[PDB]
């Protein structure tokens, strides 16, 4: 979603959310990410402003205190940023991709079934549409956020096609953006 | 249950139980935790005073000779303190949480189904409301006491949501309290 | 059964069994423990007296030549002593409990299902009432004699409650008694 | 398909394809091999011309900037070249043959079921007609491109017959051609 | 069958067998133990006499050239001697008992199911009344000849009772007899 | 099939085969052993005569350029010689027998089920009457060619009786014969 | 160092540092923790005020924008807080203590040699006075910051006495303080 | 040291200790077992009486609040009770004995070198006269308190004789005693 | 030492030992087998007669209450009987021989060095003339009592000749004798 | 030696050798490859012609009945063809390279020391200039014939530079040639 | 020693030995193979005749009751037949050769050092001229009798040349002979 994103060109506008909408979004996030519920109050303190940053290609980024927390596209599911996930690694289920596929994950490539069924992978049980943290063997930090396009059962049984769509990866344009800066877009 | 518990602020009153009521409680601890039976006369010597410390949030702690033995909420089921469980670990079934989760369990985080269905975890049969010891591979002693919110059957099938509620963890407020002290509350 | 047993306090009477009674008992032992059959002439030689040591709590110990062979409570099934089991470990199926039950087994604690379902345990088929040797991975000799309270199949399914009752363990009162002595009670 | 192929003798004709034809081949490739999609603008750019090398036995090779990309026969499915597969190995499911079969894979031999069922092999699910990369345990790059003739399930359960047809292998005529 | 057997006390008589009777016995041995068929000319050379040593308790021992080959009781099935089995171990299926059992197997004890279900044992399919070789781990030669009293399936699933009857064991009286 | 075979005693005649017969044998070989197809022009080059060596006990050996390629008995299916199999081990599925059986395989002994079900064996699916290569762990070359008498499923589940018939083995009379004139 | 620490009772005052001192501290932190160098601009941005929180028992905590970064006692070496170490886990060498000893580490207890030589431990080379991250098997977050009291070699070879001094641990008072 | 010990028979006298004697014992305990230092306040609260139970064979047991803490013989080194060691297992180095030895360790037998050199054992560095905890593999708590009679180095090299003297074991007379009054 | 021993043919006489002789034997046994010391009074109760059974080939068997405890030949060191060793296995170091040797160990065969150096053997330090228990991986009980003829060091380094002499084995004549009157 | 070898372009001559000479060639092969001795009567039957195929770059191939047996350059020591080595693999010591190298070994690439010291590799004693078979873990047959350029000891110690020269590899031009005038036999 | 041996062609004479000469041979066998001592009475019963079968190339085979026990060349050391060795395998130290060698061991080929140093081989201490059993991992019985030509130490260190000479292998001519005039007994 961010391979060619550049914070200097692709940010359009920003809105600060009202309380009822913030409460609504928190309810959505807890439904998506039951594992976030323990942490939401420190991630999004009730006193601090919550802002949505609009970018190109209908992308929106949810930010608090300049930190990029979640993003979405075309009003679809929220996804956590890698930076957030590194602090709270259990807000998503994990999938471990084989060593042969890692270079390509770091280039925005989707994860094909054979990258999950080979010996160096570990395929965790996960339903279709589940948002997941993509891990390399031996490294504790997620390298990519993806979404299951096939169930883990089907990835194992079928072993063909896109297993996990790659949404956000280490050193992509969102990674490099790091914080929300009000000086990369006009305000009126 | 005790993440924000402070012995100096959150203890309200204390009652000492009559012999007939103590016998009743013991008969029901035996039902809840059958492994405890031959040990109850040492944990709760027939001669010694048995007291219930009333705390905020409708919490009661069963205590003998200052030692904190069990706790409950709104006269519900008793749960062992971790200090007791460490001495008599056999009195609860255990669940093995993902090995990388230690930090979060030790911050009061609930055990989510993906933390139990991962290859790094071990899920054992357990009905809803079963009280369990939560273990991680890297520690020989239980990190928390949990209560099953979903059956182990449903944790595996549904694989989303709170599987086990984290009710008491190592070095939460109840652990830190360690002993009952009659000088942290008024008596009349 | 013997955690607080003391041979100096808890032995009440002794009887020597008659031929017909001995034949019945040997037939019971063979029925219970078919492995024992060719060893019965050694542990209960026909020419030697067979006695039952009556103890408190309706316990009886079957003894020959001062050796304590089997025991029972309320005239129930016979269970081998650990000393006999160690000499003839084929008498019984076994179950292996996990590390961290060992101290407790050696304190008379029953075996809870979660102690049998973990990776350090080994659980084998055994029906309710089957008499078993309880083993630890860290020890070559049975640490206790148990009786299945739940089948092995149900232990694995339910993973809660008492799976096996610990009836007799290493260094309990019976182990300590070691041999029978007719001076410990009046006749 | 290329054991006796020689560029100097079996290449008859080369055609620089027009935009509509290029665009319909790009679409068939994404259909067969969804992993290739984000890379199609790197191997088949807008700026650069796309050619088909017409060869004997009704064989066609797709090329761009002198690189050989895919091939087909009698207008059948496209198969990646090994050189392309080495750059983008995720394009195909893989199967790992036992060390005893490697010499013969490198001679154009088909992969027989017992080459895939032994303990040095690794056999993964794959339907008949699925195009696959054939791997060795002790080589990092695909040694051959194959097509499943039996499902991996049947390969395992039957353990007899041709499991995978060997279509293109390392150091065959197409490998040696290298560039156009 | 031979725990208390002493060749000096328990042999009654010997019969030299006639041609047709020998042929019948060879037929029976092939039916029982198909693995023996191409070895019969070596263990029972047609040039040499074949004898039955009649013993107490209705035991018979088939012997050729002083070698003790098979034994039976009361016209029942033949069982190989351990010395013959050691030369031709393929005659019988085997079962491997756990290390706690071996001293007792070497005392004539039957094999109880828990001796076959533990991690150091190896239990293989075998029907009731199948004659089997009993092995230890880290002992290359059979330590006893047995007969299944429960199927292997039931041994595994029930894990209680006499699994295999011990008929003949290393250093029993038949072993000690060695030759006739 | 060749334990007591001696080329000096047990070969009666040799027949040079005609084109149509040779084409028919090649078709049979491809059907039996699909792996062999692209190798037939090297093992049976069209420029060289193809012969059947007729032997005692209704045995026939297919030969080209003195090399012994395949054999059969009483018009049964063809089996590869071990020397051919060693050059092209893909002709056949394999079974691995346990260490105790190997001496006996090398004496012409059939493979009993218990020789295939033990920890040191490896038993692979194979229908009854499948021709197979018999392997030892730690010998790289097949030690015998056999034919399944019980399916692999039955071998595993029954564990009694002859599992695989030993047809030809290393250092039998056919191995020793090596080439024909 | 913080077992009985309480931010409400044990904080005395707070001072803001000057440029020349901040530059020297950064040199000191780099000399102690070579791996921190690329990250100091992020952890202590030149723009932002650097403060020292003065606490009881001569303890000082270095803080930037309310975050607790490093601490020291009586102008001793700086130590990272666990919260900072969790973000940059590589700035200290690691020692993994055995699963039997973890409960005690979480009580502030020093680490004895047998908790570091047993099977579930992993001992990495480290001289006396090396500041180390104390880890549990399988978890990427340090549970304790320690200082070597004996070398790793001494610990393995002497296997007696206090091996590592426990300075700061998960859920101690500094952990609970969290911010300033 | 306690195989035949019976609290009802072999306890002579009990003494309450004076402040200076207490300070001296705590100093000796900290010297022997430096890992106990931050726990002494819990096991020997300064406000609580410290007593010594005088027993037969010059044995003394140090007790506070009824709990049996350490013991010694003549004037010798203190040894922790097993009940104490189970609460604070880090205060001694450990040695793991092989499964064959455990029944005998629980009968008061000394640990012979072959019980420490087999694959089920785990032998760690420890000098002669070092007080150690004896562990089993498949059992999580110490089964015996011992004293090295040979160095761990020499146990491994020599593999003969008494490696570790068994001083106190699970279910011996001191274990059974459990508490004092 | 007992392969052809028969109690019905090869026992010459029996003598009852006197007090000072018994005391000396007990001292010698404790020296030889330090692990035995706490058990000697149960194995040889002071009240019960100690006898020596004098057998052919200068063999003597030490017996108490009908049990056969130790034996020697030509006034040499005492060796434990296997039945005694099985009850108290800790009193000897052990060596584990590989699979091929066991049939032969149970036939009185000595242990050759190559049976101790292979991967299925386990060879532990042991000086020349050390009395050892001989184990198989597949059996829980010693199969024979042996005496090192080469040090374990020399066995590994040289890998040729007799490593351990097999003195007494399971179901030899002494095993079979079992008791004396 | 044969990456760009083509039988239809790089072969110049073929000589049949006299009987006297063959006894010396057999002696030389026994000296270099002592395992080959009992097999020489099979490889080079007394009855059959032995020929040398003269090729470009001073290369000669020893042939019998069309089969290519050994090669040499400038009349130096013989090297087995891979096809012969596969039939008699005992005639050379081996070294095993890791998986990364296979594609490159099959491209004529020399073996660099780091390809022999990595976990997937196995190094065995071999002096400099020793002719060796190069194996991959994932293949049962030698993938090339090599010559040690450093001792195996130095390869492990130095871990830098060319360790083994790749002289002949599977499906190079010599492999591809396969036979010489098999029609003539 | 027996690859081309044929009993019907290569046996010349047979002689029965005198009692004292037999005693001497037995003493020699005990010195060579100390494990054999308690078994010699069964292998060579004092009552039964002992013969030597005299063969071509100065080979002698020691026989009793038709069985072939040991062989030697001239008056050199005796080597056990494999059939005897399989019955009493402890009489020789063993070496385990790797999988590639087995087909060739079973063709009489000597064992080259690289066949003993690879991962699937096992090499044990053994001095030059020590008689050894050669095993394969997947076979329980020795496949040949060998004699060390290099010490096991030097085989590992040097990894080149003939390590062990193959003297007698399973199904060579002596194996095939099996018995000598068994109809006489």
From Swiss-Prot, chains A, B:
Gene3D superfamilies: 3.10.400.20. It is linked to Immunodeficiency 118: An X-linked recessive disorder characterized by increased susceptibility to disseminated mycobacterial infections in infancy, notably after Bacillus Calmette-Guerin (BCG) vaccination. Initial clinical features include fever, lymphadenopathy, hepatosplenomegaly, abscesses, and osteomyelitis. Affected males usually recover with treatment, have no other infections, and show normal growth and development. It holds the Pfam family Pre-PUA. One of its GO terms (biological process) is ribosome disassembly. CDD domains: MCT1_N, PUA_MCTS-1-like. This is Malignant T-cell-amplified sequence 1. Induction: By DNA damaging agents such as gamma irradiation, adriamycin or taxol in lymphoid cells, but not by stress stimuli such as heat shock. This induction of protein expression does not occur at the RNA level, and does not require new protein synthesis. The modification Phosphoserine is found at residue 118. Interacts (via PUA domain) with DENR; the complex regulates translation reinitiation. Ubiquitous. Over-expressed in T-cell lymphoid cell lines and in non-Hodgkin lymphoma cell lines as well as in a subset of primary large B-cell lymphomas. Phosphorylation is critical for stabilization and promotion of cell proliferation. It comes from Homo sapiens (Human). It is found in: Cytoplasm. The modification Phosphothreonine is found at residue 81. Translation regulator forming a complex with DENR to promote translation reinitiation. Translation reinitiation is the process where the small ribosomal subunit remains attached to the mRNA following termination of translation of a regulatory upstream ORF (uORF), and resume scanning on the same mRNA molecule to initiate translation of a downstream ORF, usually the main ORF (mORF). The MCTS1/DENR complex is pivotal to two linked mechanisms essential for translation reinitiation. InterPro entries: MCT-1/Tma20, Pre-PUA, PUA, PUA-like_sf, Uncharacterised_CHP00451. GO terms for molecular function: ribosomal small subunit binding; RNA cap binding; translation initiation factor activity.
